[PDB]
Design a protein around this motif. Structure first.
Motif, PDB file in Angstrom:
ATOM      1  N   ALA A  85     -51.627 -58.850  19.302  1.00 58.23           N
ATOM      2  CA  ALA A  85     -50.693 -57.754  19.023  1.00 58.23           C
ATOM      3  C   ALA A  85     -50.588 -57.614  17.624  1.00 58.23           C
ATOM      4  O   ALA A  85     -50.391 -56.373  17.175  1.00 58.23           O
ATOM      5  N   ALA A  86     -50.534 -58.517  16.536  1.00 59.09           N
ATOM      6  CA  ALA A  86     -50.383 -58.619  15.288  1.00 59.09           C
ATOM      7  C   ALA A  86     -51.700 -57.882  14.743  1.00 59.09           C
ATOM      8  O   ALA A  86     -51.559 -56.870  13.767  1.00 59.09           O
ATOM      9  N   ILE A  87     -52.672 -57.787  15.225  1.00 60.14           N
ATOM     10  CA  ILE A  87     -54.198 -57.315  15.039  1.00 60.14           C
ATOM     11  C   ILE A  87     -54.075 -55.940  15.132  1.00 60.14           C
ATOM     12  O   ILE A  87     -54.565 -55.152  14.476  1.00 60.14           O
ATOM     13  N   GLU A  88     -53.515 -55.629  16.403  1.00 59.53           N
ATOM     14  CA  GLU A  88     -53.277 -54.297  16.705  1.00 59.53           C
ATOM     15  C   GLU A  88     -52.471 -53.352  15.702  1.00 59.53           C
ATOM     16  O   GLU A  88     -52.691 -52.280  15.160  1.00 59.53           O
ATOM     17  N   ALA A  89     -51.178 -53.941  15.521  1.00 57.33           N
ATOM     18  CA  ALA A  89     -50.236 -53.372  14.424  1.00 57.33           C
ATOM     19  C   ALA A  89     -50.998 -53.112  13.087  1.00 57.33           C
ATOM     20  O   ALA A  89     -50.904 -51.963  12.516  1.00 57.33           O
ATOM     21  N   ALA A  90     -51.723 -54.014  12.764  1.00 60.00           N
ATOM     22  CA  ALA A  90     -52.613 -54.073  11.533  1.00 60.00           C
ATOM     23  C   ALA A  90     -53.421 -53.020  11.422  1.00 60.00           C
ATOM     24  O   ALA A  90     -53.582 -52.085  10.373  1.00 60.00           O
ATOM     25  N   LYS A  91     -54.170 -52.771  12.526  1.00 59.91           N
ATOM     26  CA  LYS A  91     -55.137 -51.572  12.578  1.00 59.91           C
ATOM     27  C   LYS A  91     -54.520 -50.559  12.583  1.00 59.91           C
ATOM     28  O   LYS A  91     -55.321 -49.451  12.234  1.00 59.91           O
ATOM     29  N   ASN A  92     -53.195 -50.257  13.019  1.00 59.89           N
ATOM     30  CA  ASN A  92     -52.550 -49.057  12.860  1.00 59.89           C
ATOM     31  C   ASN A  92     -51.845 -48.757  11.871  1.00 59.89           C
ATOM     32  O   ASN A  92     -50.884 -47.914  11.782  1.00 59.89           O
ATOM     33  N   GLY A  93     -51.933 -49.846  10.651  1.00 56.35           N
ATOM     34  CA  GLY A  93     -51.064 -49.663   9.565  1.00 56.35           C
ATOM     35  C   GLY A  93     -49.658 -50.157   9.674  1.00 56.35           C
ATOM     36  O   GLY A  93     -49.020 -50.295   8.619  1.00 56.35           O
ATOM     37  N   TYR A  94     -49.656 -51.108  10.633  1.00 57.73           N
ATOM     38  CA  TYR A  94     -48.104 -51.565  10.767  1.00 57.73           C
ATOM     39  C   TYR A  94     -48.228 -53.363  10.609  1.00 57.73           C
ATOM     40  O   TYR A  94     -49.680 -53.858  10.681  1.00 57.73           O
ATOM     41  N   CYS A  95     -47.159 -53.947  10.080  1.00 51.53           N
ATOM     42  CA  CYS A  95     -47.238 -55.208   9.919  1.00 51.53           C
ATOM     43  C   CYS A  95     -46.107 -55.668  10.981  1.00 51.53           C
ATOM     44  O   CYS A  95     -45.337 -54.943  11.734  1.00 51.53           O
ATOM     45  N   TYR A  96     -46.087 -57.183  11.298  1.00 50.14           N
ATOM     46  CA  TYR A  96     -45.820 -57.787  12.690  1.00 50.14           C
ATOM     47  C   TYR A  96     -45.448 -59.111  12.060  1.00 50.14           C
ATOM     48  O   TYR A  96     -46.246 -59.877  11.952  1.00 50.14           O
ATOM     49  N   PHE A  97     -43.947 -59.153  12.110  1.00 47.84           N
ATOM     50  CA  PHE A  97     -43.260 -60.499  11.703  1.00 47.84           C
ATOM     51  C   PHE A  97     -42.237 -60.782  12.447  1.00 47.84           C
ATOM     52  O   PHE A  97     -41.650 -60.027  13.309  1.00 47.84           O
TER      53      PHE A  97
END
Lengths: 204, 204
Positions: free
Chosen positions: A112-124
């Motif tokens: 899920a985190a890797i997906e967010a990152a792929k889309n410009g989002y960060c996940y914390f």
């Protein structure tokens, strides 16, 4: 496709992580079990994604992150922990991680985190406790801690003595005492029981 | 079993979000188009999820966020925006949102933010510039603005002049030139060109 370097000393976590990334057509460039070669291998192989446990030995996961970012690395770095470590995410974010994920609930948050990152989002992790309830002043106290003060804290909460910490952190005993005083003072704790209770209340 | 209130005045954005929520099995208790009634209706209806555009009229989207949180609402709040507003995200995070999403890239980041929040994580834009490269100081000057300066900057960059803004923000033409000065001072900008150039350089 998409590729990654995994950095974890836990044999089972390495396996589940490996297995997850394959399952999602991510190719694994390398697998590391200590942090002392991490900066170098990352900079050489330049993978899209780095997954690093916050507690790798040698040079810890957050120290790798600060060093990589300082040296202008611009890949996706996702930090992970075996503990819950929900307060630690904020510090990882301030250091430039793309995310921080606990392995306690399994491997889906990593993808899920890797997906967010792929889309410009960060996940914390989210703490309602920062914004609601009786725990807000405790929760900023944690936010005032130094990266190092956090290490020492977490080590105290695992019941390690000054020497074990010094050895792990590659610092002298005096430096540990110093960080321990600064830590206690910021937390408004005087005794170990104070700290125990502080940790219980904030669920660390 | 999951349910939402949507707060947006853009007719297409409403339709798209509604559709997205429906297709992910989310019931919609209500749709709002202004922020004056927003606190009240959320507290009346107790939805799991609230989706708020940052520019709803009346009471500003981040003002609602702040109000609901200081009034201890504990559900999921996701701010959204029609512009990239990359820097605006940090302010919503610091004000207690679970997420900030630009509609520019489509609805699929909204559902992802929601899935993050449901797993205890939050979903915010990642700004590499904060940590790497030549724009790190600019990047923190933006972080320093007050909610009101932001509103004003965003308006200048929209092409509004002093009057439009004074009207829009419900205030006198000199409370605006007040805000306009501290704004420019924090951004170390003298002329309108200094500002245009700053905005070009940092992509706002």
């Amino acid at each position: 496709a998409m590729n990654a370097i995994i950095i974890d000393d836990h044999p089972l976590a390495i396996a589940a992580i490996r297995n997850l990334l394959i399952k999602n057509d991510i190719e694994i460039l390398a697998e590391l079990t200590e942090g002392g070669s991490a900066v170098q291998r990352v900079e050489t192989l330049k993978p899209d994604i780095v997954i690093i446990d916050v507690d790798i030995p040698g040079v810890n996961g957050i120290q790798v992150l600060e060093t990589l970012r300082k040296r202008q690395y611009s890949g996706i770095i996702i930090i992970v922990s075996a503990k819950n470590d929900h307060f630690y995410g904020k510090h990882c974010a301030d250091a430039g991680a793309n995310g921080f994920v606990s392995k306690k609930e399994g491997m889906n948050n990593i993808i899920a985190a890797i997906e967010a990152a792929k889309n410009g989002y960060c996940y914390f992790p989210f703490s309602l406790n920062r914004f609601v309830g009786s725990l807000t002043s405790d929760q900023q106290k944690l936010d005032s801690l130094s990266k190092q003060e956090i290490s020492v804290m977490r080590y105290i909460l695992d019941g390690k003595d000054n020497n074990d910490i010094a050895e792990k952190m590659f610092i002298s005993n005096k430096t540990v005492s110093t960080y321990k005083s600064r830590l206690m003072e910021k937390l408004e704790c005087k005794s170990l029981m104070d700290l125990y209770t502080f940790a219980q209340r904030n669920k660390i």
